Design a protein around this ligand. Structure first.
Ligand SMILES: O=c1ccn([C@@H]2O[C@H](COP(=O)(O)OP(=O)(O)O)[C@@H](O)[C@H]2O)c(=O)[nH]1
Ligand SMILES: O=c1ccn([C@@H]2O[C@H](COP(=O)(O)OP(=O)(O)O)[C@@H](O)[C@H]2O)c(=O)[nH]1
Lengths: 341, 341
């Protein structure tokens, strides 16, 4: 019954392979349409949606090599969004802090879903716009506390679009799936697999800022066989990568906002061995769907106990707690509260 | 008799050493205050101004190591400027395309000085906002054609604050002054000085991105005595550098928007050997204040015929075309035209 704008990042298509945010914007957008709202989606032109697509460039920016200046396109899109404020009852921003100053200039209310970590720089602008409507994606993300949080709304995935692997592959292997940043601890993953004796199949994006970290600290240990790299996985690849593993290693070293790869692994039937930072304690059910750990050697021990976990319970777990219909109903509750203020 | 906002980039102080845009904004601002206008400067908090300073962070960002997210402070500053839009008769913006969509959300008219080069990427946003008030800083910069160009206002310097050097230093040397980027061609400047056999005395800034370029193509040549660097120079230093040389080399491989170092050299008495790209043909009068060349070896030959040029005429020329009085009077004409529409 409402007019809703969905403002998606433009890096990835609303996504073929890497890209958490645009995946969540997609599932939210399509479900809001099925529920009878009038939705406009602001994303790349290749985006697939039953909503009205407003696009400022025909291709997602990252995997296009003819485009580089991201900020040009963020400004175009912010332009197309807020020059149309009166066409919507609620504006759902997923693009982060650049949307904050526009919001004080139109009268249509705006919901900001926090998709990244709070930093020493970005706390400065968030604190300045502390009264705008925020949704966190985990309780641990909220490191400000000073902001007007409307709710925590946990992320979700389309569980049914992940094949379920009742039993891991043979020959046995461990999976790493994520961007090759020090924040995701893939250096720790090679450690863990070498220590415990089970090969590792890694996968993920390597982008500039991290190219030094890769070339120096990952590249020399991939030598095929025990450490295989694969290199950035699309949906069917990563489903088979995770489902086939006995455990997905998640040795993060940073205040992880949510960690969608954890719920994607459990949906395939594969529990997660994670370092207990950021949102991992909220997502993993220690002893049931994986193990919360505080060191590499905690992780190595957890891998030795994973065979005793029920793989089918890991999938059930994501249906209960991280399903799409829950997330969209919680966002619909946020829109109601915002609109009634 | 006008309330005028000046919105400066935040990378440099409105500038101790490197910084072209922020120097020009400074000169425009201070003079607009003397002519009686009521000016607000939006710049870093260490900026020195007789206008009202509204700052979003106490120090310039490039040489601050506790700041790593320029967009945060940019988005903050655009917020401060346009939320106060009706405190001003006109907003003079120097921060590029990120102000274009804001301009559609306020009634107060905006003037954009274009300080950079058109790219395949930024033409997409300027084209979307072609009816806005643009000032180009050279004629060769105007590569779009479809835009509402109010005027060309060439940049200026405070000629009097530059010591004039009637004779170059003996033994001779050549000068380079600029950021150590491929666009500025300091690799060419080294080549030219080696073929010519006069020593090079360089100076400038290495932002990262140019870091591998400096290490591979510049660093190996500066080790010796014949090339000298003393990196990143303040005003007394750069003046003495330029004034001492027989000629400043300006071997650009870019569509240079303007090129302040050329008028800074000419003011000290030093003519310019320049590659005839971007704004170079408009700023240099070939055969009088320098030479326009098409190649490296062109510059080698032209260095030989530099002593025939009249050093006082180089300073006369900057007073005649690139003085501050000219530039501010021309900018007031632009405010007048914008308000009358
Ligand atoms: O090679 C890869 C690496 C990652 N992803 C996906 O991109 C998202 C990563 O988001 P996540 O929440 O795990 O962490 P983030 O990178 O956003 O901090 C997940 O859907 C991954 O399945 C992918 O498709 N291919
Ligand atoms: O070590 C340096 C290098 C450059 N500059 C100044 O930085 C400005 C650069 O402006 P220009 O148009 O020449 O180059 P760009 O703005 O395109 O970087 C000029 O005032 C230079 O005098 C400086 O003070 N010190």
């Amino acid at each position: 019954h409402m007019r809703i704008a969905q403002v998606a990042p433009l890096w990835e298509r609303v996504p073929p392979a890497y890209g958490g945010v645009e995946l969540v914007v997609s599932l939210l957008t399509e479900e809001l349409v099925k529920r009878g709202h009038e939705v406009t989606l602001f994303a790349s032109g290749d985006s697939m949606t039953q909503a009205k697509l407003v696009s400022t460039y025909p291709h997602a920016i990252r995997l296009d090599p003819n485009v580089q200046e991201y900020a040009v396109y963020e400004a175009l899109q912010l332009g197309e969004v807020f020059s149309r404020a009166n066409e919507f009852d609620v504006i759902h921003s997923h693009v982060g802090y650049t949307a904050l100053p526009y919001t004080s200039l139109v009268k249509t209310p705006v919901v900001h879903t926090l998709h990244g970590r709070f930093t020493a720089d970005n706390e400065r602008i968030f604190s300045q716009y502390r009264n705008q409507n925020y949704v966190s994606i985990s309780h641990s993300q909220r490191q400000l506390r000073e902001l007007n949080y409307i709710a925590t709304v946990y992320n979700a995935i389309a569980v049914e679009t992940h094949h379920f692997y009742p039993q891991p592959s043979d020959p046995p292997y461990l999976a790493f799936l994520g961007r090759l940043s020090p924040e995701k601890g893939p250096h720790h993953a090679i450690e863990i697999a070498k220590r415990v004796g089970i090969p590792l199949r890694m996968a993920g994006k390597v982008d500039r800022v991290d190219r030094d970290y890769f070339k120096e600290l990952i590249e020399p240990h991939i030598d095929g066989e025990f450490i295989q790299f694969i290199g950035e996985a699309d949906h069917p690849t990563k489903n088979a990568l995770l489902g086939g593993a006995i455990a997905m290693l998640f040795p993060i070293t940073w205040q992880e906002p949510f960690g969608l790869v954890m719920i994607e692994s459990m949906a395939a039937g594969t529990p997660v061995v994670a370092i207990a930072k950021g949102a991992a304690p909220e997502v993993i059910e220690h002893g049931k769907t994986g193990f919360l750990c505080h060191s590499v050697e905690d992780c190595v021990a957890a891998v030795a106990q994973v065979p005793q976990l029920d793989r089918m319970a890991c999938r059930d777990y994501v249906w209960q707690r991280f399903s799409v219909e829950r997330m969209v109903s919680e966002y619909e509750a946020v829109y109601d509260t915002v609109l009634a203020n």
